[PDB]
Design a protein around this ligand. Structure first.
Ligand SMILES: *[C@@H]1O[C@H](CO)[C@@H](O[C@@H]2O[C@H](CO)[C@@H](O[C@@H]3O[C@H](CO)[C@@H](O)[C@H](O)[C@@H]3O)[C@H](O)[C@H]2NC(C)=O)[C@H](O)[C@H]1NC(C)=O
Ligand SMILES: *[C@@H]1O[C@H](CO)[C@@H](O[C@@H]2O[C@H](CO)[C@@H](O)[C@H](O)[C@H]2NC(C)=O)[C@H](O)[C@H]1NC(C)=O
Ligand SMILES: OC[C@H](O)[C@H](O)CO[C@]1(CO)O[C@H](CO)[C@@H](O)[C@@H]1O
Ligand SMILES: OC[C@H](O)[C@H](O)CO[C@]1(CO)O[C@H](CO)[C@@H](O)[C@@H]1O
Ligand SMILES: *[C@@H]1O[C@H](CO)[C@@H](O)[C@H](O)[C@H]1NC(C)=O
Ligand SMILES: *[C@@H]1O[C@H](CO)[C@@H](O)[C@H](O)[C@H]1NC(C)=O
Ligand SMILES: *[C@@H]1O[C@H](CO)[C@@H](O)[C@H](O)[C@H]1NC(C)=O
Ligand SMILES: *[C@@H]1O[C@H](CO)[C@@H](O)[C@H](O)[C@H]1NC(C)=O
Ligand SMILES: *[C@@H]1O[C@H](CO)[C@@H](O)[C@H](O)[C@H]1NC(C)=O
Ligand SMILES: *[C@@H]1O[C@H](CO)[C@@H](O)[C@H](O)[C@H]1NC(C)=O
Ligand SMILES: *[C@@H]1O[C@H](CO)[C@@H](O)[C@H](O)[C@H]1NC(C)=O
Ligand SMILES: *[C@@H]1O[C@H](CO)[C@@H](O)[C@H](O)[C@H]1NC(C)=O
Ligand SMILES: [Zn+2]
Lengths: 512, 512
């Protein structure tokens, strides 16, 4: 039912965020690294027959050597019937053949098992499938389901090997009971329920849980981080991801505190999953939309991208002037395989109304990043002027320029985005929150002067912001008018004297 | 420093929300009922010298017989020096003279003690003062402070008599340590620290805690509810109030669960306090703004109102189709001293693009309410049309009408507000979030049809929404252009056939 006569790709298909060539994508699934083939695998909730969610629902599949250049493959897993779906799940590598699926002809690093929710009318079960060809084709286990609790709200298994307790661990959502259930298994087939976990912001239901050891920076120690998706009922409206920091013994997750925190405080970062088989640290990505409007955004013949892959650490950071908290840090994976088409580089710039920064690039890919370290100077200005703005401008088309704005206000110690584009209309835009804010403590002090940093990347219809070296992340989609895409970046202020010193400014036009 | 030559009152001063005649108001303080005088007392953080926060900072004072008609009095409490402030606090009635301040000539119901934070350079302490004239003038205790922990982040005491443990209880914020501290006292002068409580959404700092016994509807049971204000770092940006439900023994508050929930999910409901000496149930109100922009909004010669007084209960409500949670309910206090100028009443209205509801009132007070029960019918419509909208329109003034919109989308089971008023500019409007949403389960089912209810009241610059008989509350200010205020209400949809039946619609023009 997709109309291949209208293609928006030229102006709003991301270059380095994965999108399916056609149809509908939601949650990322089965994320893993093949150490033998040296390949990253992305699977995803996929409806090839429309640009909206529907059954039959499949695992789509793509691979990358570098987490930015993706090759889309044939559908990996499909349902038995048209009114069924292969819902979310994860992949593990069964190196030691605990499952019995793998003989000496399958390299240990390629002993690939998918654990997923099978959705049929009035029933959700956890099922497994194995791949003998490096994750391209799967055979479903003959004795599926591996877990059935007679529920239609029981989904999204994330599985990992727990060395300390010598077993497989599954975290899975009992979605409308607001429980993350922790199961254990010797062989991925026979599972025992070990504990239930309930905390944080409940919203309407629990989805896509995760549980992983995240490294503490400058340390050989880690904490266990429980990830949890809720939708609807996010405090920002719709879908959001949250996390909990604590310890895990193979049976029970015990948070260090009872505080609620979000992974990303943009509108468009949901169903976060981590890659299995990562040698150094923790990598993950999410679905870069919001259930409130994901199926209505003006893209064709596809809807949805993933976020960039991000690298997850824990750092002690000031959440106020007195107090440090061990906080989830994330920074984008952007390797040297990305081409720099053109660059603006400045240092020690005193920003004023007479000294704007303006890119003057020959053309546009619609893919840019900006990297700024700035200091707030001791200058008293009128309350309307305590800010500077990064403007992302389209080309002029039909006599107008569309823009989005990213700013910082020194009186509020807060970043903000305004993704309001007048004259772009789509269904459920009343839920498409335009103004988002993030409070941060200074990254550092230079004498008495507050220092902050900002890294942003814009990729045709998505902007990802990382405040203070990944202390806070904010992911938002944006939809410029037909044919319009990012062409030029400006950094402006209305202050006559300098309130902000840009210690370092690097703005790059990028390409695949 | 206030310019009394410019007065916006005629178009944007609320009729039934308390505002100071001039200057700056923030947190409500010292809320209590005088059972002898039959008088409600409102005190508030008050800067009479500007329409922005500054020291010296005072307790302003107003009284009401009905919680809508307020009489403003002389300042009740002031600081010793100009670089000091009487910060937030509470009042108790010391009926049995545990303090020793009151002889036989002071009616027991009028034995009024204020407990407040004294803010001086580099020090915040808890201090007390007593009134011998029914709360109009205070004498500070000669041995203040009553609590000093050598901190400049130690504020907002809410004190109550705990009958079960036969002592005074103080909840107070150790703001940047993220602790609510619970102290106990025989006499309001000598305090012992009994416990610390840390939970929920931390943001930047803890403020204005509260702890009170709230009744469960249709039962003789109750729970203890801990209230907590955070600012900045609200997930909605800036300032917000949250709550915890559990039990209290006079020493330790123990929540029933570790979930985070907000009292009000509008932008403009902060520093909530409950009235002391309420006979039946729990009444409270808040400051109806957000620290991000409170001191920049285009009102003069005052800034800020309170919310309406609200009546607080607990009810088991569906947060999803399967699961009920004991949830905080709030409904506005709107007594018979409010006059109905005009009303539109409709019932069993099958709403369509050809059947809009439009008020045709002769003039406008700028004060209206709307009370709607509606059913979602089984009709498949295009995704752009799965909603209806309540439009609140200004008069046409120099050929333009300003409006705000409250809607419901049946596909998302969510209400929304859009307070976006283009052309009205003020400092820090980048933080003035325009689009807010609230997910709700149906109030009821009529066979298979989903039933919802909405009560809204608009009072010149503030709209308060109560979804499903107070299941969710949302408070937002809005600023129409110079001279413009609400005049007419419309209820519209774009559906050609009926998707919504308005079972009952009552729209009233009100006056004081
Ligand atoms: C994600 O960020 C982490 C840093 O937090 C990166 O981990 C680092 O990765 C490199 C490999 O690229 C490691 O270097 C190797 O370490 C071994 C053992 O010391 C050494 O013998 C090898 O010669 C090699 O240099 C490095 O140790 C590691 N750092 C930590 C703290 O684990 C990781 O590369 C990032 N991943 C991506 C995709 O960006
Ligand atoms: C707030 O709500 C409670 C009901 O939830 C009201 O309590 C009743 O008040 C009347 C007197 O006005 C008593 O005779 C009843 O016994 C009370 N009922 C319960 C269940 O306690 C209270 O009146 C309300 N207050 C306001 C101002 O609306
Ligand atoms: O249908 C499930 C419900 O609508 C969720 O809010 C979306 O569900 C998720 C998360 O968005 O997508 C998957 C199905 O495509 C499912 O496995 C997962 O829990
Ligand atoms: O001290 C100001 C602080 O940063 C808060 O965000 C505002 O403080 C409050 C709450 O808004 O106002 C009062 C003083 O006006 C103080 O008692 C209370 O904690
Ligand atoms: C859906 O897409 C699948 C996979 O391409 C295809 O085989 C099938 O015919 C389609 N089903 C429907 C209902 O269109
Ligand atoms: C090992 O598995 C391979 C791949 O399916 C299969 O072809 C082969 O027969 C198996 N070998 C043995 C010894 O069973
Ligand atoms: C966990 O939750 C399940 C499903 O509700 C319940 O049956 C079981 O009693 C709980 N188990 C534990 C260990 O709490
Ligand atoms: C941003 O600049 C910092 C400081 O120069 C640098 O170390 C970092 O790698 C840059 N970030 C990105 C994403 O390129
Ligand atoms: C502030 O207002 C108070 C009370 O009206 C008044 O006594 C005083 O003159 C004012 N102080 C300053 C510093 O403006
Ligand atoms: C109570 O104290 C007041 C002064 O505050 C005084 O007017 C009065 O005489 C006293 N009454 C008694 C009964 O001691
Ligand atoms: C409560 O918190 C205070 C301030 O951090 C601390 O000194 C005290 O030891 C704590 N008391 C208890 C009983 O936890
Ligand atoms: C709204 O309508 C209901 C009847 O459905 C009524 O009982 C209730 O009091 C009304 N609310 C207000 C605040 O007027
Ligand atoms: Zn606009």
């Amino acid at each position: 039912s997709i109309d291949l006569s209208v293609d928006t790709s030229e102006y709003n298909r991301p270059l380095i965020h994965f999108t399916p060539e056609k149809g509908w994508m939601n949650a990322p699934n089965g994320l893993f690294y093949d150490k033998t083939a040296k390949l990253w695998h992305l699977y995803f909730q996929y409806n090839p027959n429309a640009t909206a969610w529907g059954q039959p629902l499949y695992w789509g599949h793509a691979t990358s050597n570098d987490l930015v250049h993706w090759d889309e493959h044939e559908i990996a897993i499909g349902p038995e019937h048209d009114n069924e779906g292969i819902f979310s799940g994860s992949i593990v590598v069964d190196h030691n053949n605990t499952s019995g699926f793998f003989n000496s002809s399958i390299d240990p690093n390629q002993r690939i098992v998918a654990i997923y929710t099978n959705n049929i009318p009035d029933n959700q079960t956890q099922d497994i499938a194995f791949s003998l060809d490096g994750g391209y084709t799967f055979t479903k286990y003959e004795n599926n389901p591996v877990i059935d609790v007679s529920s239609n709200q029981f989904r999204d298994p994330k599985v990992f090997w727990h060395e300390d307790s010598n077993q497989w661990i599954m975290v899975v959502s009992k979605s409308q009971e607001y429980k993350i259930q922790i199961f254990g298994s010797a062989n991925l087939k026979n599972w025992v329920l070990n504990s239930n976990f309930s905390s944080g912001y409940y919203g309407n239901q629990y989805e896509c849980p995760g549980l992983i050891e995240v490294p503490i920076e400058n340390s050989d120690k880690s904490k266990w981080v429980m990830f949890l998706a809720i939708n609807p009922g996010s405090p920002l409206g719709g879908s959001i991801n949250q996390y909990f920091v604590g310890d895990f013994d193979g049976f029970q997750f015990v948070p260090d505190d009872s505080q609620t925190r979000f992974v990303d405080i943009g509108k468009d970062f949901y169903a976060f999953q981590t890659f299995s088989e990562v040698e150094h640290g923790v990598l993950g990505l999410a679905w870069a939309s919001n259930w409130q409007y994901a199926d209505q955004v003006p893209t064709n013949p596809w809807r949805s991208s993933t976020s960039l892959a991000r690298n997850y650490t824990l750092r002690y950071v000031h959440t106020n002037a007195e107090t440090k908290q061990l906080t989830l840090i994330q920074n984008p994976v952007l390797p040297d395989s990305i081409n720099v088409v053109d660059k603006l580089k400045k240092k020690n710039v005193k920003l004023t109304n007479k000294k704007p920064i303006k890119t003057n690039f020959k053309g546009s890919t619609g893919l840019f990043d900006f990297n700024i370290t700035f200091k707030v100077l001791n200058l008293n200005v009128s309350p309307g002027k305590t800010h500077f703005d990064i403007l992302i401008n389209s080309q002029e088309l039909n006599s107008s320029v569309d823009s989005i704005k990213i700013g910082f206000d020194s009186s509020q110690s807060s970043f903000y985005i305004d993704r309001h584009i007048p004259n772009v209309e789509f269904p459920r835009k009343q839920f498409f929150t335009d103004k988002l804010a993030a409070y941060l403590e200074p990254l550092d002090y230079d004498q008495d002067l507050r220092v902050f940093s900002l890294y942003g990347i814009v990729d045709k219809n998505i902007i990802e912001l990382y405040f203070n070296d990944g202390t806070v992340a904010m992911t938002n989609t944006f939809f410029m008018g037909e044919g319009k895409y990012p062409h030029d970046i400006q950094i402006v202020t209305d202050t006559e004297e300098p309130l902000f010193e840009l210690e370092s400014v690097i703005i790059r036009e990028l390409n695949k």
